[PDB]
Design a binder for these strands. Structure first.
Ligand SMILES: [Mg+2]
Ligand SMILES: [Mg+2]
Ligand SMILES: [Mg+2]
Lengths: 96, 159, 165, 174
RNA sequence: GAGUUUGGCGGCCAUAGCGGUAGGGCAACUCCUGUACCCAUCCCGAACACAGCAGAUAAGCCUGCCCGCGUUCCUUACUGUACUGAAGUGUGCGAGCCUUCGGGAACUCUGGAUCGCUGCCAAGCUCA
RNA sequence: CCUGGGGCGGGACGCCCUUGAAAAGAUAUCAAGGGCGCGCAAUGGUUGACUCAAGCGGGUCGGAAACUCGCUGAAGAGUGCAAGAGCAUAAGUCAGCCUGACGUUAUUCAGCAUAGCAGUGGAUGACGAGACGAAAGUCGGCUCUAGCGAACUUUUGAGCC
RNA sequence: GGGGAUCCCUCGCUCGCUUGUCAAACUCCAAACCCCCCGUCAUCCUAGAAAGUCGGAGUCCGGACUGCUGGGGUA
């Protein structure tokens, strides 16, 4: 039977480009966001902790608040709203 | 089994050796024929395919044998250089219960082709061109697809 | 500023198996060299030579400077300071492995000890080696700065008269 | 070692071999300034650096060469020169507007009695807040004049010069 | 007040790497001289640490250059080719393929470029 | 009970990874490749010092089977166990010091796209105590995703009704 | 490494330069559809958008055509 764990079908989803593997840039981890500021979900495989479920890959949410070193996002899946915790290392601003 | 059982291309490829098991060997022994060390044949004709299909290795072996016999009989042992191109990488499986767990098991090997894709190639002199055409026409008779002959190099010489 | 000064000399002492031969190997090494040594372990278990994983097998020291000079002159006089090209290498690294040890000056004969083979090696380098080994800004030496065999023999003959065959 | 398209080349500051990015990532998580105490042979350098998406802006940058105005006519590579540099840096940064941060020694060994910890002593004694512990602070016996006693007994004009430079550092920045 | 040089901390992370070659050190960095002290070696003042005057640009670093490998970019052809979204009383015995409107490669080809760009601060200076 | 009628065979009857699956998400068959119902007081935590696989050149019968010195070496090694992913001043190797393999508690995510459903797990946190370290920080076991079970009943722990 | 006392010498497997084929569990590359968000147009909307609360159900034997070379199977 097929499994239904939390990392299924992520062979290429959670990979790094060949000229990207290793230590990722550190400035991406100290970026700071404010309220109501659209961001993009782009999971960085190099960081093991604070990773949202990879089904939210490539979605855009808005910041709602901060809990420690993690921002609270508001992502739409289908017709629902899902609140996703993610460290700022996996996030990326929207360029207007 | 009959030829038309495994000749159409309806399903995905199935060629990874390390996952399947027990593929039987092949019969075709040598893929280069005639004077390999020569490189000064001015005419280079070839047999091409008019439709996508699968060719069993046995058909390729029969075609190679017949072309070899004709070319050696007429042109000479040192007057040509035949070279087969397509190698059989596909695998053929035959179910053998009913439809209960109908997935088959390996029985042979086949080589897929594509339209206008060269299969054989013969190089000869100017005086043995007609013999080359005569040889390549019999070889295409054992082949499971319509086939036409194209003179690739030295077309102005022959034509 | 670009003369091929000797870097250091490592006095390896293999025994083929641990035990009393190993221990008195370090003993004679510290008598002959004037500083303690350190054992070397194995990498796996090879019963053919009768070894086992992570068992001590030999000895080693890394004397340098005036100790290196004195050992060089001593063992050069011992083996006539005449080196053929077999041990010799691309960077002037000699590796002459003499076996009998009592021929050293000051090694008193022992019926139990008798003989214990060793090997002597020298490493030649040009001035400037901080660059390849310092923790900060660790670069790599370029080819033109690297040492050569003929300059190695020239240095050996000029500083010690170390003839090379 | 680029031999093909799959080869991975390190960052520029890694090829230079003058940075450690894991340490940098651990340091930036403090949300607070950093004190950089990089040293050399002819002198020592201290400066306060904060991060930004473009580069690393710096607010204060004091160097041990600046003692020449005050009158520290001694060696610039000793521990006491590091203490003087740290002291004047601390006063300068306190008056400027900045007060605290984190100690960052980069790729250097953290051993007690070092010149980096001498600069740390000079910083802490000035009022510049910084988290640390006292056990690594070098004792003043080497701070004054006594780490060069055994080879330069003919030169023991240090302590009066140290006192004069300390009082002049206080005078200028107060 | 503008510029140059040097030094430190960095952003993009091979257009920056690999290899080759000719020049420079006055201020600065480095190499470089030893082991009283804090400090150190699974042995070694090698390294790290400390103390620093000598000599040197042979190395690190800096400037100029090289198409010789690797990477990035443009152009000629391959070619509007392969593939493809929508509609079709268009077509083949069949597995399939064709027409119109809209998108559009990869390799390879002729010829050129790429031997990094750039942010903050300090010091020596060089002007009015 | 499933089942290309039932039977026989087997378990596609619970959990985890790759493909099928048609470049968001979902997607069936007795579809293909398979694995798990555990092991470890160190094979765990932290700090410090280092670089691994494989070749080339040298040394004594240390034989094409040993250990050592120099060079090339972004990883071709190792990381307890499947498959896939991650990792180089390290998530690897060794040494020192330690037991966070801690008590209590709140949300959000998936199991169970969209769109109800236990128990139970995994990510952020909060209170109370610690380990290592100059500090920053890391530590809620063993780099990430498997190694497991409601109500009722008995037994055990602290204090109460 | 296999052929028949200086291993007399043959020499397959293997390593490099060139030629000819591959991949569903390969990828230095890489579309057209498609998905989240911002702006604009356009349509719906105070004769009530989005959201929320309560009442009543049926349904969980489906089938076919045009595409996906869909998977399996000789079909
Ligand atoms: Mg039944
Ligand atoms: Mg019903
Ligand atoms: Mg219809």
């Amino acid at each position: 039977t097929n499994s239904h764990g939390e990392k299924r079908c992520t062979r290429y989803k959670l990979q790094k480009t060949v000229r990207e593997r290793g230590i990722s840039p550190v400035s991406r981890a100290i970026q700071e966001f404010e309220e109501g500021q659209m961001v993009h979900i782009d999971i960085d495989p190099s960081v093991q902790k604070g990773m949202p479920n990879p089904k939210f890959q490539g979605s855009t949410g808005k910041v709602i608040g901060q809990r420690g070193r993690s921002y609270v996002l508001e992502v739409r899946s289908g017709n629902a709203m899902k609140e996703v915790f993610s460290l700022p290392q996996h996030l990326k601003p929207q360029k207007y | 089994k009959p030829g038309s059982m495994y000749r159409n291309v309806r399903q995905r490829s199935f060629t990874r050796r390390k996952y399947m098991g027990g593929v039987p060997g092949s019969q075709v022994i040598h893929y280069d024929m005639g004077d390999k060390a020569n490189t000064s044949f001015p005419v280079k004709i070839s047999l091409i395919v008019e439709e996508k299909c699968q060719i069993r290795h046995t058909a390729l072996e029969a075609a190679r044998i017949t072309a070899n016999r004709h070319l050696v009989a007429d042109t000479g042992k040192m007057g040509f250089y035949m070279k087969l191109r397509v190698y059989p990488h596909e695998v053929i499986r035959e179910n053998k219960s009913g439809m209960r767990r109908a997935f088959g098991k390996n029985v042979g090997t086949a080589a897929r082709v594509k339209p206008m894709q060269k299969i054989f190639t013969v190089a000869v002199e100017k005086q043995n061109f007609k013999a080359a055409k005569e040889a390549l026409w019999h070889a295409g008779q054992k082949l499971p697809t319509p086939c036409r002959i194209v003179v690739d190099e030295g077309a102005e010489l022959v034509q | 500023m670009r003369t091929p000064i000797v870097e250091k000399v490592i006095v390896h002492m293999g025994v083929g198996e641990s035990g009393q031969h190993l221990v008195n190997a370090e003993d004679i090494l510290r008598n002959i060299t004037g500083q303690e040594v350190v054992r070397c372990f194995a990498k796996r278990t090879l019963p053919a030579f009768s070894i086992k994983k992570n068992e001590p097998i030999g000895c080693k020291v890394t004397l340098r400077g005036q100790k290196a000079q004195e050992f060089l002159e001593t063992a050069l006089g011992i083996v006539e300071k005449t080196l053929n090209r077999s041990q010799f290498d691309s960077f002037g690294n000699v590796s002459f492995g003499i076996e009998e040890h009592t021929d050293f000056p000051g090694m008193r004969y022992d019926p139990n000890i008798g003989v214990f083979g060793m090997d002597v090696t020298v490493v030649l380098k040009r001035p400037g080696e901080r660059i390849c080994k310092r923790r900060i800004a660790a670069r790599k030496i370029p080819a033109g700065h690297r040492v050569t065999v003929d300059d190695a023999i020239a240095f050996l003959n000029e500083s010690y008269g170390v003839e090379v065959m | 070692m680029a031999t093909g398209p799959r080869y991975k080349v390190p960052f520029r500051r890694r090829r230079e071999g003058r940075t450690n990015y894991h340490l940098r990532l651990k340091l930036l998580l403090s949300r607070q300034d950093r004190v950089v105490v990089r040293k050399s042979s002819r002198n020592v350098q201290i400066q306060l650096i904060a991060p930004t998406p473009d580069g690393d802006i710096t607010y204060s940058s004091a160097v041990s060469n600046e003692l020449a105005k005050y009158g520290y006519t001694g060696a610039t590579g000793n521990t006491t020169a590091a203490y003087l540099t740290g002291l004047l840096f601390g006063l300068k940064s306190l008056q400027k507007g900045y007060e605290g941060g984190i100690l960052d020694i980069g790729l250097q060994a953290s051993s007690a009695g070092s010149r980096v910890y001498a600069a740390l002593k000079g910083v802490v004694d000035s009022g510049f807040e910084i988290p640390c512990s006292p056990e690594v602070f070098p004792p003043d016996e080497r701070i004054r004049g006594e780490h060069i006693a055994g080879y330069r007994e003919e030169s023991s004009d240090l302590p009066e010069q140290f006192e004069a430079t300390k009082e002049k550092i206080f005078a200028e920045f107060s």
